[PDB]
Amino acid sequence: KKSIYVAYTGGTIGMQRSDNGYIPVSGHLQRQLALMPEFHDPEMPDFTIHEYAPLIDSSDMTPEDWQHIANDIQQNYDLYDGFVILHGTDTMAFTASALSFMLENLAKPVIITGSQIPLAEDASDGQTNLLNALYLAANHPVNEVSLFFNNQLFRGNRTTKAHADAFASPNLSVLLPLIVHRITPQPIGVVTIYPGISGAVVRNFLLQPVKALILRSYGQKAELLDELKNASDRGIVVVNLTQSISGSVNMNALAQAGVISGFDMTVEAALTKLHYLLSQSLSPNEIRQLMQQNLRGELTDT
């Protein structure tokens, strides 16, 4: 019989309504699930919940949090058949992409999910999200980092926020020895190019401490290309995402200024992948070459 580890890392799913808003209550999630027979059906896997203290606030969390989640998966990896990571919904897709890069040789399912409402409340998708995540982690395993929301299973490093209040992978079809790499915060600019953006503005985006820049550009101004080439000549890694809802960069003026294509990668995959590559002992050229390679299913280059 399958057994699933559930990491309650943070998010509203396990919290309680007060008048001053949602508040954390130690062990509340498991006490509420003990009252919910759907979770104890003989078709369902066994599962255990561990709670992080303090809970990670997903709107104010760092790459050190990604590391702590990955270390927790690694510690439990051999004891369970699969892993569900409960998380705040607003940066869930960043956590999912980061974990995809950090967990090399992953051969068990890892499903990130959460809910905006405490899971006992009428309007909460908490119960349905956790039930499906548990069931999918046990029985229909894709040995990857996946994300479960709005009733679908997405590939983790292909999901992007898709409504304000909330997930899509616009560039991939929905799905339905463990090595952990180190990751640390990195100074990365993610900027949107628009008509007439000035040299002075772009120059400022490239000041220290920036080590890399993600450009979201259109589906050749001398002063823009000059600043980008100068940045690449001092080792700044510049990645172009043809920032539209869906589709790919096909790179060339940008190429000649040292910009590399991010192909159809989401902002979440590019940002987490640069954190991953900059945190290893790689040179700018090695990072440029690896950013363009499909490392974990995040990008299509034929």
Name the one range near a second copy by CB under 8 A: 28-36, 130-138, 166-174, 282-290: 166-174
- Site size with Ca ion, rule: CB under 5 A: 2
- Residue 52 touches which of a second copy, Ca ion, none (Cβ within 5-8 Å per kind): Ca ion
CB count within 10 Å of CB 1 equals 8
Q: Which of a second copy, Ca ion, none has residue 163 at its interface (CB below 5 to 8 Å by kind)?
A: a second copy
Of 14-22, 108-116, 136-144, 280-288, which segment contacts Ca ion by CB under 5 A? 280-288
Partner interacting with residue 25 (select from Ca ion, a second copy, none; CB below 5-8 Å by kind): none
Q: Which of 281, 274, 278, 280 is nearest to 97 (CA)?
A: 274
| Residues across the chain | 302
By CB under 8 A, the count of residues binding a second copy is 62
> What are the Cα distances from residue 17, in Å, to 33, 118, 121, 164, 268?
17, 8, 9, 22, 31
Does 209 sit behind a cis peptide bond, omega within 30 degrees of 0 on the bond before it? Answer: yes
Nearer to Ca ion, 289 or 300 (CB): 289
Residues 6+ away with beta carbon under 8 Å from 226:
199, 257
Considering the candidates 9, 12, 91, 95, report the single residue annotated as catalytic: 12
Active site residue 9: no
Q: Cβ atoms within 10 A of the Cβ of 147, count?
A: 29
Return residues touching a second copy (CB under 8 A).
57-66, 89-91, 94-95, 160-166, 168, 170, 185, 187-192, 194-198, 200-201, 204-205, 207-210, 214, 216, 218-221, 242-250, 264, 267, 271
